Design a protein around this motif. Structure first.
Motif, PDB file in Angstrom:
ATOM      1  N   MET A   1      34.688 -47.095  11.791  1.00 16.58           N
ATOM      2  CA  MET A   1      35.870 -47.968  11.785  1.00 16.58           C
ATOM      3  C   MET A   1      35.749 -49.086  10.748  1.00 16.58           C
ATOM      4  O   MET A   1      36.703 -49.337  10.021  1.00 16.58           O
ATOM      5  N   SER A   2      34.588 -49.735  10.667  1.00 16.27           N
ATOM      6  CA  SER A   2      34.413 -50.880   9.748  1.00 16.27           C
ATOM      7  C   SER A   2      34.104 -50.505   8.309  1.00 16.27           C
ATOM      8  O   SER A   2      34.205 -51.340   7.424  1.00 16.27           O
ATOM      9  N   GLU A   3      33.684 -49.267   8.098  1.00 18.20           N
ATOM     10  CA  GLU A   3      33.427 -48.764   6.775  1.00 18.20           C
ATOM     11  C   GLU A   3      34.761 -48.361   6.175  1.00 18.20           C
ATOM     12  O   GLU A   3      34.954 -48.450   4.969  1.00 18.20           O
ATOM     13  N   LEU A   4      35.699 -47.929   7.003  1.00 16.44           N
ATOM     14  CA  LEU A   4      37.059 -47.731   6.501  1.00 16.44           C
ATOM     15  C   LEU A   4      37.770 -49.080   6.227  1.00 16.44           C
ATOM     16  O   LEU A   4      38.425 -49.227   5.175  1.00 16.44           O
ATOM     17  N   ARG A   5      37.641 -50.058   7.135  1.00 17.36           N
ATOM     18  CA  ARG A   5      38.264 -51.369   6.901  1.00 17.36           C
ATOM     19  C   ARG A   5      37.790 -51.774   5.524  1.00 17.36           C
ATOM     20  O   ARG A   5      38.600 -51.964   4.605  1.00 17.36           O
TER      21      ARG A   5
ATOM     22  N   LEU B   1      43.243 -58.953   9.262  1.00 16.75           N
ATOM     23  CA  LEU B   1      44.516 -58.270   9.543  1.00 16.75           C
ATOM     24  C   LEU B   1      44.496 -56.749   9.357  1.00 16.75           C
ATOM     25  O   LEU B   1      45.513 -56.070   9.546  1.00 16.75           O
ATOM     26  N   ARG B   2      43.331 -56.208   9.005  1.00 21.51           N
ATOM     27  CA  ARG B   2      43.180 -54.766   8.897  1.00 21.51           C
ATOM     28  C   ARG B   2      43.021 -54.250  10.316  1.00 21.51           C
ATOM     29  O   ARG B   2      41.927 -53.989  10.798  1.00 21.51           O
ATOM     30  N   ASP B   3      44.162 -54.169  10.977  1.00 17.28           N
ATOM     31  CA  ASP B   3      44.298 -53.553  12.286  1.00 17.28           C
ATOM     32  C   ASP B   3      43.357 -54.064  13.391  1.00 17.28           C
ATOM     33  O   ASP B   3      42.774 -53.277  14.091  1.00 17.28           O
TER      34      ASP B   3
ATOM     35  N   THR C   1      45.595 -66.261  11.193  1.00 14.98           N
ATOM     36  CA  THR C   1      46.642 -65.319  10.764  1.00 14.98           C
ATOM     37  C   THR C   1      46.879 -64.263  11.864  1.00 14.98           C
ATOM     38  O   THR C   1      47.966 -63.741  11.984  1.00 14.98           O
ATOM     39  N   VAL C   2      45.872 -63.991  12.683  1.00 11.47           N
ATOM     40  CA  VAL C   2      45.994 -63.016  13.794  1.00 11.47           C
ATOM     41  C   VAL C   2      46.617 -63.640  15.055  1.00 11.47           C
ATOM     42  O   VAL C   2      47.430 -63.020  15.731  1.00 11.47           O
ATOM     43  N   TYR C   3      46.184 -64.855  15.366  1.00 11.43           N
ATOM     44  CA  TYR C   3      46.828 -65.720  16.365  1.00 11.43           C
ATOM     45  C   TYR C   3      48.352 -65.791  16.187  1.00 11.43           C
ATOM     46  O   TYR C   3      49.108 -65.487  17.108  1.00 11.43           O
ATOM     47  N   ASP C   4      48.806 -66.193  15.015  1.00  9.34           N
ATOM     48  CA  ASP C   4      50.239 -66.206  14.684  1.00  9.34           C
ATOM     49  C   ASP C   4      50.901 -64.870  14.951  1.00  9.34           C
ATOM     50  O   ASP C   4      52.044 -64.792  15.413  1.00  9.34           O
TER      51      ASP C   4
ATOM     52  N   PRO D   1      46.074 -51.690   6.820  1.00  6.74           N
ATOM     53  CA  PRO D   1      44.636 -51.460   6.580  1.00  6.74           C
ATOM     54  C   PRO D   1      44.111 -51.938   5.206  1.00  6.74           C
ATOM     55  O   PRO D   1      42.920 -52.210   5.102  1.00  6.74           O
ATOM     56  N   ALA D   2      44.985 -52.078   4.198  1.00 11.06           N
ATOM     57  CA  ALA D   2      44.585 -52.546   2.835  1.00 11.06           C
ATOM     58  C   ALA D   2      44.870 -54.030   2.589  1.00 11.06           C
ATOM     59  O   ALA D   2      45.018 -54.465   1.428  1.00 11.06           O
ATOM     60  N   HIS D   3      44.953 -54.800   3.674  1.00  4.11           N
ATOM     61  CA  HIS D   3      45.534 -56.138   3.603  1.00  4.11           C
ATOM     62  C   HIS D   3      44.599 -57.127   2.934  1.00  4.11           C
ATOM     63  O   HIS D   3      43.407 -57.089   3.165  1.00  4.11           O
TER      64      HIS D   3
END
Ligand code: ATP
Ligand code: CL
Ligand code: CL
Ligand code: CL
Ligand code: CL
Length: 539
Positions: free
Chosen positions: A124-128, A176-178, A229-232, A169-171
């Motif tokens: 999961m984190s290697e894709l992020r 913010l990558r999911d 940014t995730v809180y918002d 995912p490319a953010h």
């Protein structure tokens, strides 16, 4: 109860313009450990703000992790907040909001805004990292509900599956990558028992608990500046749903973490100290737990003052332990009655004095606007500090020595007659009274004053001399942090105190002249076997 800060400015501008009818803050610790002096900053900030502006403040247990959290920690958290003198408007448990957060989740899934992911942590984190999308990302709304539901029934094991928000995912922003909204733990919660098996992540739960309670300003430390940014995102995308307000909304503000020299506050290290027997337990006065500081003898008022005195800012500047120690001395000064104890006892015999007498002795010096006296006993047999006699005294020596006379505090002046030795060291002193309330007739004043007790009336005492816990300012990041422990952190000495102390309430805090502030250790002390912690030394 909070000096003007970047925040106090912004609360006033909001209240005054009617953006929120009232200020509502919260203190939201996780019940998985004890509070330290750092948490005091958040306590005073958030609770003071309430009382300062006639608002409310919630004591909330952000209890989203069942593995570590225990009810005794939440009992303790409330004990420690109330002990600093603050009155939560409400005591809440984020865990009692789980049904609402879950229902919110369903809404995200319905709206194509969350999805269930099967990939394990590493991939999961290697894709992020690559800004790549999980292959599971674009699952059907239907598929997602069905698997989320199976997650809820506990069909999959711990770790196996999570729900993530579908943002980008490319953010540019990595947070913010999911981000993961929900994980799986097959473990019971101290508060909500065995009801739940999916549990929300911090970045989902916090805004929601904020929102649900109607918090207006959500104050946290600078670690979570990146988490904004995730809180918002949670609030904006859930506003108006599942019984939640469309407006107003909570907004996050970050202030500087407290960082104290000669101390560590990172839970991880604190755990090492305790389980390692470096320290006795979590309320050991060597510790900067609120538990330990209470036991040490520090008044909550000293802690709140210290916090107010250091102020609130973005000044990450490490605070010096001198400072804290000085606010403690300062705090105890006008209210700690003054008495005589001896910590390193050396016996003195007076060859030219017989019998006993009792000297009226003031608790309070000229500076303090408090009168108050005590019977102080005197006899031919005394103890003084071994440290206040010398056979070879230095230049400015203000204490007892073979030629030089000395003033016993609140009593007579004495001079050395004889020294009695054994094992190449000093075992007893034979001396001579010269002077009660008067200079020596011959005019050669004693250069200084020392404390003492009658060996004939003094109570034995186990003195616990607490020093700073580390010799280095920055043990936290210094590397070898255990090799920076101070071996003098605790020195146990067996000494004596004037008997007056037996007629005092057990939470009386004393200054023992020329030694520091002290009180009965609230756990161990017994009137028939006194135990006294040193709260802080003098300057
Ligand atoms: N050293 C500190 N100084 C000031 N505030 C702190 C400090 N440590 C934690 N806090 C605040 O106390 C709140 C609750 O503490 P909690 O134990 O749940 O978090 P933790 O310390 O990061 O672990 C946090 O939101 C945090 O902002
Ligand atoms: Cl807004
Ligand atoms: Cl006698
Ligand atoms: Cl005085
Ligand atoms: Cl004196």
């Amino acid at each position: 109860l909070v000096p003007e800060c970047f925040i106090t400015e912004l609360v006033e501008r909001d209240l005054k313009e009617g953006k929120y009818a009232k200020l509502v803050t919260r203190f939201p610790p996780e019940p998985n450990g004890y509070l330290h002096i750092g948490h005091a900053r958040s306590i005073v900030l958030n609770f003071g703000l309430a009382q300062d502006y006639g608002g409310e403040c919630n004591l909330r247990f952000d209890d989203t992790n069942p593995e570590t959290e225990k009810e005794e920690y939440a009992r303790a958290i409330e004990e420690d907040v109330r002990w600093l003198g603050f009155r939560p408007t409400r005591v809440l448990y984020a865990s009692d909001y789980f049904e609402t957060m879950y229902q919110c989740a369903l809404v995200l899934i319905q709206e194509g805004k969350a999805y269930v992911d099967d990939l394990p942590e590493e991939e999961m984190s290697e894709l992020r990292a690559q800004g790549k999308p999980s292959p599971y990302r674009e699952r059907s709304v239907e598929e997602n509900l069905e698997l989320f539901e199976r997650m809820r029934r506990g069909e999959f094991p711990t770790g196996s599956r999570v729900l993530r928000a579908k943002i980008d995912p490319a953010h540019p922003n990595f947070k913010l990558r999911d981000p993961v909204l929900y994980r799986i733990v097959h473990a019971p919660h101290y508060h909500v028992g065995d009801r739940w098996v999916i549990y929300p992540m911090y970045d989902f739960a916090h805004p929601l608990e904020d929102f649900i309670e109607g918090v207006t300003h959500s104050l946290c430390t600078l670690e979570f500046e990146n988490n904004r940014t995730v809180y918002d995102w949670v609030i904006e995308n859930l506003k108006g749903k599942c019984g939640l307000p469309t407006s107003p909304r909570p907004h996050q503000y970050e202030f500087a973490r407290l960082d104290l020299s000669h101390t560590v506050l990172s839970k991880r290290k604190l755990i090492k100290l305790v389980e390692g027997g470096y320290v006795s337990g979590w309320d050991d006065p060597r510790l900067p737990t609120l538990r330990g500081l209470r036991r040490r003898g520090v008044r909550p008022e000293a802690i709140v003052e210290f916090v107010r005195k250091t102020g609130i800012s973005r000044n990450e500047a490490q605070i010096e332990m001198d400072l804290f120690e000085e606010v403690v001395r300062d705090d105890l000064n006008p209210i700690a009655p003054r008495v005589l104890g001896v910590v390193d006892p050396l016996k003195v015999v007076l060859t030219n004095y017989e019998g006993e007498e009792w000297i009226e002795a003031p608790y309070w010096p000229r500076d303090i606007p408090k009168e108050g006296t005590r019977p102080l006993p005197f006899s031919p047999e005394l103890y003084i500090e071994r440290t206040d006699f010398s056979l070879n005294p230095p230049k400015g020596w203000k204490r007892l020595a073979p030629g030089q006379r000395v003033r016993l505090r609140h009593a007579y002046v004495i001079e050395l007659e004889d020294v009695v030795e054994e094992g190449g060291e000093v075992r007893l002193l034979k001396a001579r009274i010269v002077t009660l309330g008067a200079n020596p007739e011959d005019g050669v004043r004693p250069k200084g004053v020392i404390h003492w007790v009658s060996a004939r009336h003094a109570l034995p005492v186990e003195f616990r001399l607490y020093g700073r816990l580390f010799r280095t300012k920055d043990p936290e990041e210094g590397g070898d942090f255990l090799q920076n422990l101070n071996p003098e952190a605790l020195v146990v000495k067996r000494g004596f105190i004037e008997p007056s102390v037996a007629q005092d309430p057990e939470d009386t805090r004393y200054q023992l002249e020329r030694l520091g502030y002290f009180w009965r250790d609230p756990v161990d002390s017994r009137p028939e076997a006194l135990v006294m912690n040193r709260i802080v030394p003098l300057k």
